[PDB]
Design an enzyme around this catalytic site. Structure first.
Site, PDB file in Angstrom:
ATOM      1  N   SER C  12       0.820  -1.201   0.000  1.00 12.25           N
ATOM      2  CA  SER C  12       0.000   0.000   0.000  1.00 12.25           C
ATOM      3  C   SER C  12       0.859   1.257   0.000  1.00 12.25           C
ATOM      4  CB  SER C  12      -0.952   0.015   1.202  1.00 12.25           C
ATOM      5  OG  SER C  12      -0.240   0.063   2.427  1.00 12.25           O
ATOM      6  N   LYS C 185       6.288 -16.345  12.295  1.00 14.27           N
ATOM      7  CA  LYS C 185       6.129 -15.477  13.468  1.00 14.27           C
ATOM      8  C   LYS C 185       4.676 -15.088  13.694  1.00 14.27           C
ATOM      9  CE  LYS C 185       5.778 -11.276  13.942  1.00 14.27           C
ATOM     10  NZ  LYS C 185       4.575 -11.536  14.794  1.00 14.27           N
ATOM     11  N   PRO C 186       3.876 -16.006  14.257  1.00 13.21           N
ATOM     12  CA  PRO C 186       2.527 -15.569  14.619  1.00 13.21           C
ATOM     13  C   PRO C 186       2.582 -14.748  15.894  1.00 13.21           C
ATOM     14  CG  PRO C 186       2.921 -17.786  15.437  1.00 13.21           C
ATOM     15  CD  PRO C 186       4.127 -17.417  14.610  1.00 13.21           C
ATOM     16  N   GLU C 190      -2.817 -14.715  16.207  1.00  9.40           N
ATOM     17  CA  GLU C 190      -2.489 -15.489  15.015  1.00  9.40           C
ATOM     18  C   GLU C 190      -2.188 -16.956  15.329  1.00  9.40           C
ATOM     19  OE1 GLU C 190       0.540 -12.864  13.508  1.00  9.40           O
ATOM     20  OE2 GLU C 190      -0.975 -11.471  12.714  1.00  9.40           O
ATOM     21  N   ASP C 256       6.977  -6.153  11.921  1.00 10.50           N
ATOM     22  CA  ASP C 256       7.851  -6.177  10.747  1.00 10.50           C
ATOM     23  C   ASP C 256       9.314  -5.969  11.116  1.00 10.50           C
ATOM     24  OD1 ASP C 256       5.309  -4.428   8.851  1.00 10.50           O
ATOM     25  OD2 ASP C 256       5.636  -6.576   9.106  1.00 10.50           O
ATOM     26  N   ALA C 286      11.485  -0.623  17.719  1.00 10.62           N
ATOM     27  CA  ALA C 286      10.460   0.014  16.916  1.00 10.62           C
ATOM     28  C   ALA C 286       9.489   0.773  17.804  1.00 10.62           C
ATOM     29  CB  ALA C 286       9.723  -1.008  16.078  1.00 10.62           C
ATOM     30  N   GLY C 291       4.709   7.234  15.893  1.00 14.55           N
ATOM     31  CA  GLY C 291       4.039   6.873  14.665  1.00 14.55           C
ATOM     32  C   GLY C 291       4.523   5.575  14.056  1.00 14.55           C
TER      33      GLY C 291
END
Ligand SMILES: Nc1ncnc2c1ncn2[C@@H]1O[C@H](COP(=O)(O)OP(=O)(O)OP(=O)(O)O)[C@@H](O)[C@H]1O
Ligand SMILES: Nc1ncnc2c1ncn2[C@@H]1O[C@H](COP(=O)(O)OP(=O)(O)OP(=O)(O)O)[C@@H](O)[C@H]1O
Ligand SMILES: Nc1ncnc2c1ncn2[C@@H]1O[C@H](COP(=O)(O)OP(=O)(O)OP(=O)(O)O)[C@@H](O)[C@H]1O
Ligand SMILES: Nc1ncnc2c1ncn2[C@@H]1O[C@H](COP(=O)(O)OP(=O)(O)OP(=O)(O)O)[C@@H](O)[C@H]1O
Ligand SMILES: Nc1ncnc2c1ncn2[C@@H]1O[C@H](COP(=O)(O)OP(=O)(O)OP(=O)(O)O)[C@@H](O)[C@H]1O
Ligand SMILES: Nc1ncnc2c1ncn2[C@@H]1O[C@H](COP(=O)(O)OP(=O)(O)OP(=O)(O)O)[C@@H](O)[C@H]1O
Ligand SMILES: Nc1ncnc2c1ncn2[C@@H]1O[C@H](COP(=O)(O)OP(=O)(O)OP(=O)(O)O)[C@@H](O)[C@H]1O
Ligand SMILES: Nc1ncnc2c1ncn2[C@@H]1O[C@H](COP(=O)(O)OP(=O)(O)OP(=O)(O)O)[C@@H](O)[C@H]1O
Ligand SMILES: [K+]
Ligand SMILES: [K+]
Ligand SMILES: [K+]
Ligand SMILES: [K+]
Ligand SMILES: [Mg+2]
Ligand SMILES: [Mg+2]
Ligand SMILES: [Mg+2]
Ligand SMILES: [Mg+2]
Ligand SMILES: [Mg+2]
Ligand SMILES: [Mg+2]
Ligand SMILES: [Mg+2]
Ligand SMILES: [Mg+2]
EC number: 2.7.1.11
Lengths: 309, 309, 309, 309
Positions: C12, C185-186, C190, C256, C286, C291
């Site tokens: 996206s 990697k769940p 998940e 990610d 992260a 943001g």
């Protein structure tokens, strides 16, 4: 002018507090609350005081919260007639969120009444002289059967007390069961529930109001319409009054302000048009003030002059 | 009836999506969006189609999003006249929250316009015949100096194009700088910004509207007042029209629906009263439909009949 | 170190915008958006770049939005291999609310893929040399049958490509259908969906992860646990790594970042403990940034040193 | 096992109510509230009861709200020792929103305490036998100078009362001013405020905790870390305990449940490890229950068994 009384079967000692942000799960740290009188008839009496008149507030008070409620009204020079109740005066919460300027209002039921406390309240009401006006306003607390409210109103009317009603749900229907109510002020939702039908067509509100008058349930129905003002209906007249195009800061207390204003005009035997115009003036004046503050004399006077051309 | 055109310098391809709850921090899973045309003048043209008229939408379109915007209007049988722009047509987002029934509307700026592209749009406008109506509605996109908007309107008026303006901020002031605008529709906030003062007194809106007419900036000023309806001002008349007391489902599209209706009345050379009444009817009809749906013919007719009774 | 590729079937072009307040019904005026690359595999490649390695992002791109997506990655020095798609690259929205500091994230599906575009993507994947690593990360876009994803993975493994998977729902189950996945990697939700049972008991996550390894579906399962870090499971080892007690500013991009970090350690043939520790370091790094910003090299290094004693 | 007492200078009678939606401006109709005991030390005593122990809650109570608070604890079989206060026991509000499942918690200050009342509370504390444990938990109410809190703790310690402290802001610093506190449980924010610095680096929490132990202010410092569990520090040991990966339903009551558990372990003269493990087990057990419900014995036992495996 005849004397004016109000009845609040479910009063409250409200807390107004401030917190920086609003979000779930976490503890929202709120400031030391400012206490204020709560309840329909009580706020009607307060509005009347603001407008330069006098109304005696009748209500049950219990515990330290009840004592503080009475103490607050004394400081505002609002005369009262209280009945001591076993169950403590309950509290609603008003939260101002600093970051957004929004206000949140959590409204819980009033304290319970037992049969003896209600009997004392009815006794206070029946001490009111013929010709005087009684404004019955607010929710019905636990412990009171619906027919007891109707019987109180019937007894009042029997000895010449002129009754004005502002309520909702089963209480409002019950208050109107016997009829000959001088004035009722449903809002749109309240009107719809009362006539038990959706009001979706342009003329439905007017027709529903007229239906109530024609049935003999009320002599005057003033359907209040929020920012659109109000529609007043008599057996001979239908008038809509729209407020001036000034932004609302906070709508809290608009209904009680309007009722207090209309009550004063009813006491002066004003015309339906004058009554509704003064009601819109005070209700909309209430919206000019932040938080829970009611109408001010000067703002109401200014809007009333505008509405009168 | 003369021909009607609209101008949207900042169109959009809007996405309408659905999500179960709204809360911060986490990913809100939204449904595959339904695309719809966005933009002031574009929506005015769509409203006009709903009301049985026809208006040609002039706007810049860029990229695949612009192509889809054009295709959506074709499917709605709204005639268009486009200029291909380098910067792709931007998207606003409408989010419906299932748990609350609330809608959230994120409005971002339109695509940029370079000087060549604006001159191309100006060329389209000056192909409009004398006596026809041009509705300039919506925000001002990046890349367009306020003076160029003034120049466009001055250019159009010199050759008999009748201009109607609905905008805000510096763009609205710039659009009215030349004067002799046929009709402007500020809302209350837009009027306040235009005359550069708080409108806190009952007569302030009317006085401000009359000031604009008296100064020669606009022939007609209709200040729209949300649920209070609208105040229309002429060199000769002043009228307020209030909608009937029906509950709004969703206010989205009220403004553009009102402008579309008043434009049609203007094309029929109707009275100020007829124009404002039809405007309020369409504006309020728009509020009866959920989401972004504009006014329907039948609802507008029903409300208009009531206002004209 | 062997080469690293990522695959994003649903990329996206995300918009990040700012608005003063959030509330329903009204237009929320949002700032000119800042565009950023979006999509699982794409962000994995970006995280890897931040950490000092190199990963080539494979993905479909369509229209002007797609071109800008590719342009953004070029400026970040992230190598790409793209397939031109008919349907335009879609946009998700990130909204920062100034008054509260909260962020809202509206995630919609990616653009459609036709069978020819998927075939080209598979062709790109099969150009990857034996021994190299492919990270398949993100949602499955419309137009792709579940078995096509499984067939792609099977074809990849057939010629020696080492596959890492991060996905959800039916896509994740399908990606694991054939098995021999190097690393999955769940997160907790998940994992629960994948083993199709609620994980309510203390040892359930560990047991569920081991069930996946024992079945042959994946060689390594790293269940990521948000602020609790992660549990990594091998055929011989079970290790939990908990991040340092530092406040998270924003969790966006943690997943990610962790995957990119673990991929690099997998490329270095690191131990399970080293891999999971570096993954927690980057994921938690992260969270230190506002943001959507991913992990920084220096923050990841600092946390990794702490986790390593 | 020695006897356990708790001290709550700011207790409350909390109202838990339900409403369908949350939004500003309008009246939110809330259900008749369920009343529950509120306050740090009070909740520590309740948690201790759940875990099979016994603790006497010392607190000021005033008015009918105070009477109800006392009655609720009697019904829960929590022993109390009260001082009658002039100012009525204050109420916090817990609101459950049905549409979202979210809970909102409005926390206001406790009732005021005059100097006489505080000395009465001090008198109660000094009747505690030597060797017994006193848990001072919760906020500092209006009317109490920080120096008086310091004086109370110093007075208690001089005669062998073992003090555990859980508080915040200036009250926490004042409570630790005397030193030799048996145990303090700051969360991360409370630790940061106590040492007066941002704790932004991985080792900052541990170093800060060790600083307090080394300075002689507390014998044991357990920094609770929400979902990350806790870090316990001694003059000889440092341990981190992380809860199992089970989803929290509601975090309300985690802190007081943890303190209750650690207090019981302290009374059994347990190791630092056993104390922190049981603390994390109870804290996390609390999160498994909806709303304000504290830890249950069985859930705490199950988690503790896992941590001790
Ligand atoms: N600014 C915020 N926006 C949204 N949610 C928040 C915000 N701040 C806190 N929360 C929510 O409240 C929870 C706890 O926040 P907080 O740090 O205030 O701890 P607390 O338990 O409420 O109070 P305390 O510090 O007294 O222990 C967080 O997990 C989060 O879910
Ligand atoms: N948004 C508004 N703007 C201007 N005036 C208002 C607004 N809302 C209410 N008023 C004025 O207050 C009067 C009464 O308010 P409303 O019709 O909302 O009654 P209500 O719902 O019974 O009030 P309440 O919620 O306080 O009990 C209105 O008739 C109007 O004059
Ligand atoms: N029903 C909710 N109400 C309020 N906040 C929520 C709710 N659900 C999730 N959140 C917030 O979003 C964060 C993450 O939620 P979630 O379980 O959906 O994970 P995610 O990161 O958004 O998505 P994913 O499963 O794809 O990784 C939570 O930490 C919490 O702060
Ligand atoms: N809440 C409402 N109830 C009934 N009618 C409404 C309401 N809001 C708007 N309308 C109708 O729509 C007309 C125009 O709406 P409004 O005055 O809000 O203009 P606007 O702010 O320019 O609209 P928009 O935000 O769509 O651009 C009003 O004059 C009125 O007829
Ligand atoms: N600060 C706020 N908090 C909550 N709701 C708001 C707030 N401001 C506006 N709203 C909601 O948005 C509606 C319209 O607000 P606003 O005055 O911004 O008009 P608008 O239609 O969004 O924009 P415009 O001025 O362009 O016509 C209001 O009726 C109200 O419901
Ligand atoms: N609130 C947090 N505090 C500290 N570290 C965190 C936090 N959330 C995530 N992390 C770190 O990021 C890693 C991955 O995040 P998480 O377990 O939430 O995966 P994810 O849900 O797949 O992420 P995403 O929603 O971005 O796809 C964690 O294992 C942890 O190291
Ligand atoms: N479902 C909702 N979502 C967002 N806002 C709402 C919602 N319902 C009501 N409001 C806000 O509350 C205001 C009034 O709502 P409502 O119809 O309940 O009247 P009220 O004054 O709160 O109560 P009452 O009927 O007793 O007079 C509205 O103007 C609107 O701003
Ligand atoms: N989201 C969570 N998931 C699992 N366990 C938790 C969570 N939050 C708290 N706990 C458990 O409860 C213990 C204490 O909670 P926390 O560290 O938040 O203290 P606190 O902020 O003082 O609590 P409180 O706000 O109730 O006073 C934690 O150490 C942990 O064992
Ligand atoms: K007010
Ligand atoms: K609509
Ligand atoms: K981030
Ligand atoms: K709980
Ligand atoms: Mg009312
Ligand atoms: Mg109301
Ligand atoms: Mg508008
Ligand atoms: Mg508007
Ligand atoms: Mg993830
Ligand atoms: Mg996540
Ligand atoms: Mg705590
Ligand atoms: Mg906490």
């Amino acid at each position: 002018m005849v004397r004016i009384y109000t009845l609040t079967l479910a009063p409250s000692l409200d807390s107004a507090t401030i917190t920086p942000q609003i979000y779930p799960e976490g503890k929202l740290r709120c400031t030391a609350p400012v206490f204020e009188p709560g309840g329909g008839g009580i706020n009607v009496a307060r509005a009347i005081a603001h407008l330069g008149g006098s109304a005696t507030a009748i209500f049950p008070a219990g515990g330290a919260t009840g004592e503080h409620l009475v103490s607050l009204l004394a400081d505002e020079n609002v005369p009262v007639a209280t009945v001591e109740a076993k169950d403590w005066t309950r509290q609603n919460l008003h939260v101002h969120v600093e970051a957004s300027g929004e206000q949140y209002r959590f409204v819980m039921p009033g304290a319970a009444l037992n049969e003896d406390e209600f009997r004392q309240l009815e006794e206070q009401v029946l001490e009111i002289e013929s010709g005087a006006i009684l404004v019955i306003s607010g929710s019905l607390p636990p412990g009171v059967k619906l027919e007891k409210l109707t019987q109180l109103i019937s007894a009042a009317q029997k000895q010449g007390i002129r009754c004005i009603v502002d309520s909702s749900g089963e209480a409002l229907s019950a208050a109107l069961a016997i009829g000959n109510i001088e004035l009722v002020k449903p809002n749109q939702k309240e009107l719809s529930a009362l006539v038990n039908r959706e009001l979706t067509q342009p003329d439905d509100v007017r027709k529903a109001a007229q239906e109530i008058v024609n049935s003999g349930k009320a002599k005057r129905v003033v359907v209040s319409l929020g920012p659109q003002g109000a529609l007043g209906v008599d057996s001979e007249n239908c008038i809509q009054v729209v407020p001036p195009p000034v932004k609302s800061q906070s709508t809290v207390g608009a209904g009680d302000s309007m009722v207090g204003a209309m009550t004063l005009k009813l006491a002066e035997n004003a015309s339906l048009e004058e009554m509704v115009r003064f009601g819109v003036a005070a209700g909309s004046a209430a919206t000019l003030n932040q938080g829970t503050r009611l109408c001010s004399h000067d703002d109401t006077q200014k809007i009333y002059a505008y509405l009168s051309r």
